[PDB]
Amino acid sequence: MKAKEIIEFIETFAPKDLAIEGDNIGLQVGDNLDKEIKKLGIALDPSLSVIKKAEKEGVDFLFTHHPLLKDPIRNFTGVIYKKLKILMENDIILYSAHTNLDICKNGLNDALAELYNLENPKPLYDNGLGRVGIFKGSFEEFLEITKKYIHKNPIVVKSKEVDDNFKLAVLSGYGLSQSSIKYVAEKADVYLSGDLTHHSKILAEELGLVVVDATHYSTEVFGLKKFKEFLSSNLDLEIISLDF
Amino acid sequence: MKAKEIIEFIETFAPKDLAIEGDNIGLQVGDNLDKEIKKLGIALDPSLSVIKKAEKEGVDFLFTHHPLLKDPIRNFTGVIYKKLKILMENDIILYSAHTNLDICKNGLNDALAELYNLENPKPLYDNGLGRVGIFKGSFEEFLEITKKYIHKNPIVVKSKEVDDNFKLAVLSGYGLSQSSIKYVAEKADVYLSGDLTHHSKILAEELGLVVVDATHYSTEVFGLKKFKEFLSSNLDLEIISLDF
Amino acid sequence: MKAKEIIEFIETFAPKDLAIEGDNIGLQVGDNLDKEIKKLGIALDPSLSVIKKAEKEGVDFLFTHHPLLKDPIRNFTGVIYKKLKILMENDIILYSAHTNLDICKNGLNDALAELYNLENPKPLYDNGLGRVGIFKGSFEEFLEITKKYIHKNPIVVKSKEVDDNFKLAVLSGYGLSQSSIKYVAEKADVYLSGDLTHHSKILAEELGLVVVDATHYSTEVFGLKKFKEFLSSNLDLEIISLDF
Amino acid sequence: MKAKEIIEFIETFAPKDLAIEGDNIGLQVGDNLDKEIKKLGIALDPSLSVIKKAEKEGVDFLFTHHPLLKDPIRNFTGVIYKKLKILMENDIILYSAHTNLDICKNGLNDALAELYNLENPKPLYDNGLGRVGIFKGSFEEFLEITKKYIHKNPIVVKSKEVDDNFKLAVLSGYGLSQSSIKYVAEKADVYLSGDLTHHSKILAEELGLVVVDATHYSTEVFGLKKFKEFLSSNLDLEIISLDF
Amino acid sequence: MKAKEIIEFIETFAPKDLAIEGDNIGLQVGDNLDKEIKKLGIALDPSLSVIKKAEKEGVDFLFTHHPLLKDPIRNFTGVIYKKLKILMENDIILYSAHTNLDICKNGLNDALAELYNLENPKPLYDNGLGRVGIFKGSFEEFLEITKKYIHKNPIVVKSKEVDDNFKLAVLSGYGLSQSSIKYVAEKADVYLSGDLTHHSKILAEELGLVVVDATHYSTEVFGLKKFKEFLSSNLDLEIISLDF
Amino acid sequence: MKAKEIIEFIETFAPKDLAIEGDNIGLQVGDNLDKEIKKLGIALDPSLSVIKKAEKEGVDFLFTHHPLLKDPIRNFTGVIYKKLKILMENDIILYSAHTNLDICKNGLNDALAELYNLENPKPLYDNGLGRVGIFKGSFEEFLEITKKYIHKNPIVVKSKEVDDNFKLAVLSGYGLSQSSIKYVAEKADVYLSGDLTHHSKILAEELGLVVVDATHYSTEVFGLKKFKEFLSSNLDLEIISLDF
């Protein structure tokens, strides 16, 4: 399989114009997309560890959820230097599907919507992120589900009592900034995401929004793992995981 | 019946303050507002054709939905020369009611809402455009109405199954732009508008918003026809459609 | 009770970061928060009257809902001079909790929501302001409550008939601007707030949104009285109202 | 002789790209450039008076220094309706050379310099406007050369004692701006231009710049006449002034 | 005499509209422009120290060169609280002439350009600040003038030889920022101003501009001193200085 | 010789804070600055050719005048990928002094001022770039000094005839863009720089400035050669040239 083969498959599943404004998705590093690919590695972050592990395990196509750089640079030293050296020396391709993999059909968010069997889900945000629907069940049933498949000990901000069949909002990753709490407060009863700060915790309690912090890692990995199966089940490649 | 009176009647049906920020509504071309109006001509667009047919039919007050120019200019050459030429040579007044007609009670958007008999309809966008409510029927009957009343073969992106009594958003004109689509996907099961783009279609299929494109023309001309009947009913003068 | 204790007590109830962007909340005028406080006066507005009255009453901590200044200055002349001269000459502390008091749990907006016993209420705006939920009753029952507890002769714009159990939006203060109304029109059947312009009236009529103008004063002062009681029930302090 | 060739010729004398930023130079109103021209009028501005006179005289190419519209418009009524009316019914072409004609070799600004017999003259402003140099002579011969050839009675601000052989900056048209004074005060002893607000006057005195206000009309038409003579001489077809 | 006349006098020498863009000139803290004035004070800076001294000396009109605030504020605490409390308890008026006093004839910049008898002294910057002219002498003479009148031990940055009869630029106050140094370097050989940052020194050595740091206090208080006398020689007023 | 010592040397000569706003100077690609340097290579440009010759001729420190990237990037493919690879497999350090090397004492502009022996030469622009001064000589003398040392067959725009002892302006590199041409024409009789656009030609002609285009290669390489010898004189290690 050529590099371009894989990239085409991915991009058909997670088209690039799904990506929110400014998101650095697609080819991060690479000079030849005709190159044949023996091993594909999959990670959350293109960290220095992941890059080294990739080269050690002989990965020649490195796919990561996060991009190598959010903000552009024009000077190459420190960590970024090291990351680039390895990738280029070993001719490893780094390719990224960030928000487009979150937003796409059956993507990271839909995976959470599907997990909780959300009735009539809709996107949560103006930019396509997150899903929101009714959870046909009790709050504790929802809690169990979170504990069983997402993250075993989630911090809960019980801001209000929660009736059966409540509106569940889910966002894979970092979804618990203040602006996001305030926004989702209009649209839901419970908000399942990751990275609750004290300020945001107070805010949630003030507006009556029930937050469950399953952390950014766990919600991402859950979707990413199913993307691995999808990758595995549809491609001949040896595919391994480096972050999970 | 003077021109200013006709203007006052229309401005009473659709007040100018209803217009979205920026819209160029009102007196487009014209100097003598006391001038007695003999034949009123109504068209969707003040194209070079319409402005010629106005000259041919002795139209001396020309109403359009679309304004003459979106963006100002300070040089007069090309088509716009020709347009202003035919208009000032024959002292034909040109007047437009644009998004104010899209937004007012029983305007172009209400026209659509009324046609599908939307249960508890409400404005779709923050600026007052579009309507959204429950369609008390099958997706099928919605299709039937659309075909029967608006456009005979709409392109349809059946992004997922549509259960009976679905939420239908409607927008007359060019409503199928990427920004629109993601926003409407939060609020509706089915979106009826015109002018689907490739990028727009993909967002829709991915987000699960079923989209129905019946062109900017067909969706606008429906409400515009009702507007003509409305003018003919309340105003004693001949009114021709130059455009439908 | 020291100044800084009262402030802590107020800020624990109405956390500052709740405030909307740009809001001038907190300490308005003061130098020694360690000082001792005998008499706390509470007002809507830090008007010249309120400040004049404050001093003659021996109020040494003056709380207001509105900040002393929305827009900053670098010159001290006329009215603002006269206000500061008093506050300073008498070392009277001036401190506001504005939209943070509008937004917090059991704040000015939650008060109204509870007055009307809204069913499953949620915030109205992206920034925490307003509450919206179902009013389990008839429109008439709803007006009688408005008349009894808020303002005896509210102006009503009956743009549409209102069925029982309608969706009711409430916004304490100045919530009846053209942009506000366009927005709430998407989300409510009836909008209860204060201060209607003629354009806002017409716009509400075109969109189908029934507006009840109960004045900005009446909708704010209802909640402040609740806040005053709460303060009285919690502080061993003399608290008087300068404004109501 | 055709329109384009007249234009081709004028752009020869004054290249369009010489013009300052955002200055509206070139074709103002015109349909067709293969139109054989008969009479060519010129004037400073395309006022209504100039434009009626141009039609009256059967002028079919109207050259103006000042362009028709500075800032652009998308509505056509009032004075601009009238102007655009006359030019289009009588197929009259309107062309402008504004700052390019102020700037080019032997432009209106060189004209003031050439006439004033200046020592080693150079551009006065960053954008190519004005000329500055030494006047071999006295103040008095200078006032005289002005009264006789420019404006028979100028207003003099005698900020400073002026000595023979001085720095004389000249600027054709409006150039007594409060900031044009501040700047020209660095770079000359005497400023010669047009239209002195009492503010500009007081400033120039305060800084020691000697200003001589010969109005905008006088100093602009001086150059224009030469351009007129430069025009009639080098081309066959007849050429009148409509403004001087 | 009365406050509003003192102010009318100061604005007779120094128009407020002479001051550069955005400068906070005029009344700083004042309510009663018809207050009879007994004891005028002049200071460079309205520090808390000066303001205390004004109340202790019984000053009832405080004139400073620098404004009380450059940036507008809407809260009042700490230092500004203190300055205001004293200025308002004692009803002391604070008025300021800033760059208007720097720019006027015989202002703070002309003061320097006369100490050094500069020949043909012109404005330095585009905003009217500063004076530049040929110094009819030797660098040595220049520097001895500087040490006697302005400031005794000025830091000199001299990277090359100043000839005789050179371009001297003077700026009262702070004129030794980087970008100004780059700019005076195209226009003078020597540059007398205040406050040299290290980065600025380096820049001056590199570009060949000879810089004399005379402190900002000294280069200002020189011309302030001509003022205090000019003011004393024209008013029946007790006039004392609180900063010199 | 450690890399940091080499760097600290260059920066002593041409300090970093000398560079114009936004100029990407300093370390460009490099991990280890303690690295020992056996062979320094210098070039005008970090072109792909140059980076290859550096690897070929065993260069372990590459100094360039021009930076590797002016505009930031966050994707690594194509040319930039190739440049980066060679520098990072081979651990070659890329470093640059750009406008700081044009602006520093005895930098690239001074070198030209040196070569033409300009009388009391000063910075041309506000940013520190360029040099202007009296050329105590004849024009044909100037031409010969130019043909001999800079570039053999200059392209010359003789717009006006030149007196001996004229003002000469030099700018190492790209300096013949229309905006520059207008500025310089205020300040100089002849302007010597590189890369003359046809639109810049006419502008100079019409403005009456003499322009001598000796390409940007030659004008920069002249002072680059002097800088190279300077390094040699003061430093061990072999210093080769890669562009000249």
How many CB pairs lie under 8 A apart between chains D and F? 37
H helices present in C14-152, as ranges: 48-56, 78-89, 99-103, 108-115, 139-149
Other chains touching B, judged by 3 or more CB pairs under 8 Å: A, C, D
Residues of D within an 8 Å Cβ radius of B: 24, 26-31, 67-78, 81-82, 84-85, 88-89
- For E106, the 3-state DSSP assignment is coil
How many CB pairs lie under 8 A apart between chains E and F? 37
Contacts by residues D142-150 (CB-CB < 8 Å, ≥ 24 positions apart): D142/D116, D142/D168, D142/D190, D143/D212, D145/D115, D145/D116, D146/D192, D146/D212, D146/D214, D149/D115, D149/D222, D150/D214, D150/D218, D150/D219, D150/D222
Residues of C in contact with E90 (CB under 8 A): none
The span from the CA of C219 to the CA of C150, in Å, is: 6
The span from the CA of D181 to the CA of D70, in Å, is: 23
A15·B185 Cβ contact <8 A: no
A76·F84 Cβ contact <8 A: yes
C103·A178 Cβ contact <8 A: no
In this complex, which of D120, D123, D132 lies closest to F207 when CB atoms are compared? Answer: D123
Residues of A within an 8 Å Cβ radius of F: 24, 26-31, 67-78, 81-82, 84-85, 88-89
| Residues in a beta bridge with C193 | C213
- Taking the CA of residue F48 and the nearest CA in chain E, the distance in Å comes to 33
Residues of F within an 8 Å Cβ radius of D: 178, 182-183, 185-187, 189, 199, 202-203, 205-208
Which residue of F lies nearest to E162 if distances are taken between CA atoms?
F120
Which candidate in A12, A13, A18, A104 is best for mutational testing of the B interface (most B CBs within 10 A)? A18
Which residue of F lies nearest to D123 if distances are taken between CA atoms?
F186
Chains D and A touch (3+ CB pairs under 8 A): no
H helices present in chain A, as ranges: 3-13, 48-56, 78-89, 99-103, 108-115, 139-145, 178-187, 198-207, 216-234
Q: Is A65 annotated as a binding residue?
A: yes
Q: Is C191:C181 a contact under the CB 8 Å cutoff?
A: yes
In single-letter form, the type of residue at position A151 comes to: H
**Among B7, B81, B6, which Cα is nearest to B51's?**
B81
In single-letter form, the type of residue at position C42 comes to: I
- The strand ranges marked E within chain D are 26-29, 39-43, 61-64, 93-96, 118-123, 131-135, 155-157, 166-170, 190-193, 210-213, 238-241
Which residue of B lies nearest to C180 if distances are taken between CA atoms?
B126
Residues of B in contact with D27 (CB under 8 A): 75, 77
Would you tell me which CATH number, out of the four given (3.40.640.10, 3.40.1390.30, 1.10.1040.10, 3.40.50.1100), belongs to the domain A2-98+216-240?
A: 3.40.1390.30
**Among F120, E129, E100, F123, which Cα is nearest to D186's?**
E129
Q: Is C50:C118 a contact under the CB 8 Å cutoff?
A: no
F187·D18 Cβ contact <8 A: no
Residues of C in contact with A199 (CB under 8 A): 17
Residues of C within an 8 Å Cβ radius of B: 178-179, 182-183, 185-187, 199, 202-203, 205-208
A72·F73 Cβ contact <8 A: yes
> What count of Cα atoms within 13 Å lies in the side-chain half-sphere of residue E91?
10
Which candidate in A34, A35, A73, A76 is best for mutational testing of the F interface (most F CBs within 10 A)? A76
Chains B and F touch (3+ CB pairs under 8 A): no
C81·E70 Cβ contact <8 A: no
The span from the CA of A212 to the CA of A219, in Å, is: 11
Question: Which class in CATH covers the domain with range C99-215?
Answer: alpha beta
Pairing of strands E190-194, E238-241: unpaired
Which residue of B lies nearest to D29 if distances are taken between CA atoms?
B76
- Taking the CA of residue A11 and the nearest CA in chain B, the distance in Å comes to 12
Q: CA B31: distance to chain centroid?
A: 26
Residues of A in contact with C105 (CB under 8 A): 205-208
| Residues in a beta bridge with B209 | none
Q: Is B67:B25 a contact under the CB 8 Å cutoff?
A: yes
Q: Is A101:A26 a contact under the CB 8 Å cutoff?
A: no
H helices present in D120-215, as ranges: 139-149, 178-187, 198-207
**Among A243, C32, A154, which Cα is nearest to C7's?**
C32
Which residue of D lies nearest to F187 if distances are taken between CA atoms?
D122
> What count of Cα atoms within 13 Å lies in the side-chain half-sphere of residue A93?
24
The span from the CA of F17 to the CA of D105, in Å, is: 41
Q: Is B195:B180 a contact under the CB 8 Å cutoff?
A: no
Q: Give the DSSP letter of residue A171.
A: E
In this complex, which of D183, D189, D199 lies closest to E126 when CB atoms are compared? Answer: D183
Q: How far is CA C46 from CA C79, C171, E27, F105, in A?
A: 12, 21, 24, 62
In single-letter form, the type of residue at position D232 comes to: S
The span from the CA of B125 to the CA of C182, in Å, is: 8
Check if A2-98+216-240 and A99-215 are the same fold.
yes
- Taking the CA of residue E76 and the nearest CA in chain C, the distance in Å comes to 5
Other chains touching D, judged by 3 or more CB pairs under 8 Å: B, E, F
In single-letter form, the type of residue at position C241 comes to: S
For A119, phi then psi, to 5°, come to: -80, 120
Q: Is E65 annotated as a binding residue?
A: yes
Residues of F within an 8 Å Cβ radius of A: 24, 26-31, 67-78, 81-82, 84-85, 88-89
- Taking the CA of residue A181 and the nearest CA in chain C, the distance in Å comes to 9
Indicate the burial class of E47 (C-beta count within 10 angstroms; 0-12, 13-18, 19 or more): middle
Indicate the burial class of F163 (C-beta count within 10 angstroms; 0-12, 13-18, 19 or more): exposed
- For A202, the 3-state DSSP assignment is helix
Which residue of D lies nearest to B87 if distances are taken between CA atoms?
D85
Q: CA C60: distance to chain centroid?
A: 22
Three-point CA angle B5, B8, B14, nearest 5°: 145
Enumerate the domain spans of chain F. Answer: 2-98+216-240, 99-215
Residues of E within an 8 Å Cβ radius of C: 24, 26-31, 67-78, 81-82, 84-85, 88-89
Q: Is D45 annotated as a binding residue?
A: no
Both tokens of B123, joined, read: 């404005």
Chains E and B touch (3+ CB pairs under 8 A): no
Residues of B in contact with A121 (CB under 8 A): 208
Q: How are strands ordered across the β-sheet holding B26-29? A: B26-29, B93-96, B61-64, B39-43, B238-241
The span from the CA of E213 to the CA of E197, in Å, is: 10
Q: How far is CA F124 from CA A174, F143, F164, F168, in A?
A: 52, 21, 20, 10
| Residues in a beta bridge with E61 | E40, E93
Listed resolution, Å: 2.7
Contacts by residues E223-227 (CB-CB < 8 Å, ≥ 24 positions apart): E223/E101, E223/E107, E223/E108, E223/E109, E223/E110, E223/E111, E223/E112, E223/E172, E224/E42, E224/E44, E224/E65, E224/E108, E226/E106, E226/E111, E227/E42, E227/E101
Q: Is D220 annotated as a binding residue?
A: yes
